[PDB]
Amino acid sequence: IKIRITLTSTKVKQLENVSSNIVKNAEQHNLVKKGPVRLPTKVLKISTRKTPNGEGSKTWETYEMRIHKRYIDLEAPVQIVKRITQITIEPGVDVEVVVA
Amino acid sequence: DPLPPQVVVKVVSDTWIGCESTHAISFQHLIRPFNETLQTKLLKLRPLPTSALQNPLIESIYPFKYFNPMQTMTFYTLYNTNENAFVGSPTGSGKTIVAELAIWHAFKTFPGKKIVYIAPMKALVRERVDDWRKKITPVTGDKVVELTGDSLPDPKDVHDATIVITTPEKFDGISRNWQTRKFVQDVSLIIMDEIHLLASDRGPILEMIVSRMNYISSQTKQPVRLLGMSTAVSNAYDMAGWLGVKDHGLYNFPSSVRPVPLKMYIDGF
Amino acid sequence: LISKKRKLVADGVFYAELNEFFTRELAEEGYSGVEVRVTPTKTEVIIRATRTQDVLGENGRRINELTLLVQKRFKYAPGTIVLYAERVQDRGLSAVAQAESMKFKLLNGLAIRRAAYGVVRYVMESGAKGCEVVVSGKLRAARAKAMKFADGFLIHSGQPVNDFIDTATRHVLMRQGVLGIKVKIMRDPAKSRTGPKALPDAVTIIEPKEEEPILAPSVKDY
Amino acid sequence: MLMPKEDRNKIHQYLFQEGVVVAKKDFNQAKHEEIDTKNLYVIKALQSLTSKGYVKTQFSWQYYYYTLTEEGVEYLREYLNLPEHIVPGTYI
Amino acid sequence: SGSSKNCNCQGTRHPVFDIAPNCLHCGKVVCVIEGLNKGKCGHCHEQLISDKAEENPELLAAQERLDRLLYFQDTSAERTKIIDNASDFDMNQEVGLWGSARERALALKKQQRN
RNA sequence: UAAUUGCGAUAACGAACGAGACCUUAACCUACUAAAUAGUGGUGCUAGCAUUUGCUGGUUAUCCACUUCUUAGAGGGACUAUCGGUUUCAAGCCGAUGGAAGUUUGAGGCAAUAACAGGUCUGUGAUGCCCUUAGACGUUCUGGGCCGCACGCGCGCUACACUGACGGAGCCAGCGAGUCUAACCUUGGCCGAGAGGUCUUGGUAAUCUUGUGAAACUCCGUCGUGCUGGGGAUAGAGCAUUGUA
RNA sequence: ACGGAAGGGCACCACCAGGAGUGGAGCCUGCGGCUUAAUUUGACUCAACACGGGGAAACUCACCAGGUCCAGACACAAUAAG
């Protein structure tokens, strides 16, 4: 069935928490699991002039958003897969799953 | 039924104006156990009454030919399948016939077994046997031996007995001997009624019995079919997951549907 | 089908759209921030204000329209958006709210010296290690000058400022011109309870228990 | 301006049952969402009611959220000649 | 449709086949997915569809209450009603006659007559 | 001492902000957790040469294993560690060894009190006032100009050559970006000197562009101290693309 | 605060030892000037001059010569289904 679940929170600490519970949730049911894989952090940089007018020493800021991504692969028949998505929803940590 | 945004408390004085305070209580801790499973009555217009049974031995008995209407999703599901399932039937809506599916479930596959029935109170023991003295034994040639505290039957008769009816406390004592009691090896299906007594004192006696068989099934590595007889129960999900039942087959009907309508009235004193 | 490179970028702007909406809509109802919660098929939002009944209203009116405005504007399917109304805890500690009161006090002829110094005593009373209020612009004179009122102590340097002080600004409309409000409030670290619990340089020692010498080899058997 | 009665009739009756209408601040865009008319009329026909104290307006990054006020409810009722408490926007 | 996917959900996760709600031989419930892809049972491989006095009197008499049971389930929303001794029972359809008081004006006229 | 950073002396004591600490990034871990959206080895099918045991290889549903290399999460790791000199022997300083790191380890983010009549009304549906508000300083359409050139300045790029120019070949990176109601990043095929064009492809992206096979670079050839094959504004002619133009 | 005053100590927006340079030549761009209908405009040592994130063909646009529209909400009064 090849259940593939992706997790792409902007925040890492709670993402690990919502990831830590999943892997133990598979083994507690004695289910085959393929481990979490942490993709490289996506750093979103934006470099802009500091000043709102055009005057002054040429001072620049850059702003970084970190987009951590995690995903864990599972295989199981359908009866125990629909009982996973509907739980473990935490703020700013979206969860998406793809079958097959 | 439509979940409101919140549940809010209001405090208001009775003499002044505006002496009011408000708190909006959110409820988000809504988990899959926190629900009623239930089933909607589907289109089951055509039954399989008696004719579609493939056993003339029993087709010659039980003169009530039409199949039970309230067994819509039950019908022949457990008749052939070995899978544990929960059947919650409010009131006396077929408690006699539905409890008799144990012979239908796996007795034809292997006959001459000692499938054990369990009743919550000793009163149910007499009716579960006395009414059946002229319905099954004279036609199926299978004897039933009651196992109670006031009865001490010959163990050879118990071994040769087909159906055993025992209260959980009396069943507990014989359940203390699974290590050496050669009587208890033929357990393939265990059936009990009024399984929602756990809130009572006797519920703990019955509850620990099921977990005993789960270890037996887990340790001995063979499946043991279970069957639950009860009325509508609020926490259907948690008990279903504890009996080890699976998606195919689950009976949860509310008090709205009954063989006879029920009228109610409230008063205070 | 939107890349997470843009999906979440669009997700943060959805929060920023909503926040600037409310502080324009429920400003007098003690708006104190918001957070966006995402659930599969369920989109829920938590509104923080001091008067929860006014945010909610009879028959859940105010939320029902506010839910209804967000319903139409962002083209949600019916019932896919749910609003939550909640109070702000420790209203005397939140810079967003205490900024509004200063915007309230000024408009009512209240003295900038008296009105500002009023909020600072209550903020420190409500559990703040430090707090200050800055008011800028024309004050009793056409020449612009700024007066700063402060109490306690505040840090200007390091990321603890992000962690330990919250910012708030609310412009004031007055027929002398615009008088600015800037509020930085330093909550008690001892009640942080999420991440750090004290300043980085705070080093504490647990007191031991002294013990007198036995002065003798002694025997306790079993 | 001079413009058919068909759509102000549509505009106000639409504003009636739900009580919120949203129209972008995009001049001459000419196609409102779920209103086949042009935003030009939607944007301006309403502050007139606001001008005579009937509805309230926000900018919110030029989106023009609209919602009728408490006494805005009845005025439309005789405008559409519906009965008292036909289908207000105060439905639960 | 010739699909080999034997959907044995028994209607648990799929709508049941209206024409063939079950199997005539072994009682397995056949959903819509199991219906169009195959006309044969998945369990016992029995055909589901063949290519008042005469009818058994108890078969049609039985389904009469089933429709009632379906009616009971369908009309179960108000079956939880409570008569009580404190229930006002304003017996109004949706309003108190449009919130207008002229139906009882004749009662005042009757009082004037009395 | 980089430091109102410390020792200490002391009509001051106890405090506070700045400094530091803080955190992001960078190098260490053959250690925990793992990983065809990463790789490595072996094993199946298979190409070439000596064939004898090899070397170079190709192969996704051929498998199995692993995490050194790549990813992170969780952690440790530097505090000048130790040794010797010098100083009331006080903060320290200097040298040496070890250590991935010993000029707060490098680079940053952060960054006070007071002030400028600095810049900004041409970001603001932020605003006080003044002007105008209907052949409007408002809005919107066609075409100009913001680029016009006697000259004077500032940031610059390109060179004046043999450490060179040009023709061939050798052949190596990192930070990034990229389509849904759109038409983005485009491989491959084919056409075309070239510019570029056409039929398809994968990609909402550790998986496709992309090993971004870049250049300066390396070697082999041509030239040869000639304002020359240096240098390429100037002009002119034609061929495609962008976009209504 | 200032000192062609003193002590002590710093800094390649200082110097020393030096590199690579710029100021010389072509061009790209910005500012002044000249011009024109207009060549919109802010900033003039450090702390302006490849700066307004300003590499403007329309648009951007503020300017020049022209051409359409009113977005006058709202209230009051006037005309008024010949």
Ligand SMILES: [Mg+2]
């Ligand atoms: Mg091979």
Ligand SMILES: [Mg+2]
């Ligand atoms: Mg030493």
Ligand SMILES: [Mg+2]
């Ligand atoms: Mg540093």
Ligand SMILES: [Mg+2]
């Ligand atoms: Mg400005």
Ligand SMILES: [Mg+2]
């Ligand atoms: Mg220009």
Ligand SMILES: [Mg+2]
């Ligand atoms: Mg410059």
Ligand SMILES: [Mg+2]
């Ligand atoms: Mg060469």
Ligand SMILES: [Mg+2]
């Ligand atoms: Mg690379």
Ligand SMILES: [Mg+2]
């Ligand atoms: Mg040349």
Ligand SMILES: [Mg+2]
């Ligand atoms: Mg230096």
Ligand SMILES: [Mg+2]
């Ligand atoms: Mg020098």
Ligand SMILES: [Mg+2]
């Ligand atoms: Mg040079």
Ligand SMILES: [Mg+2]
């Ligand atoms: Mg300087």
Ligand SMILES: [Mg+2]
């Ligand atoms: Mg133009």
Ligand SMILES: [Mg+2]
């Ligand atoms: Mg132009």
Ligand SMILES: [Zn+2]
């Ligand atoms: Zn199905």
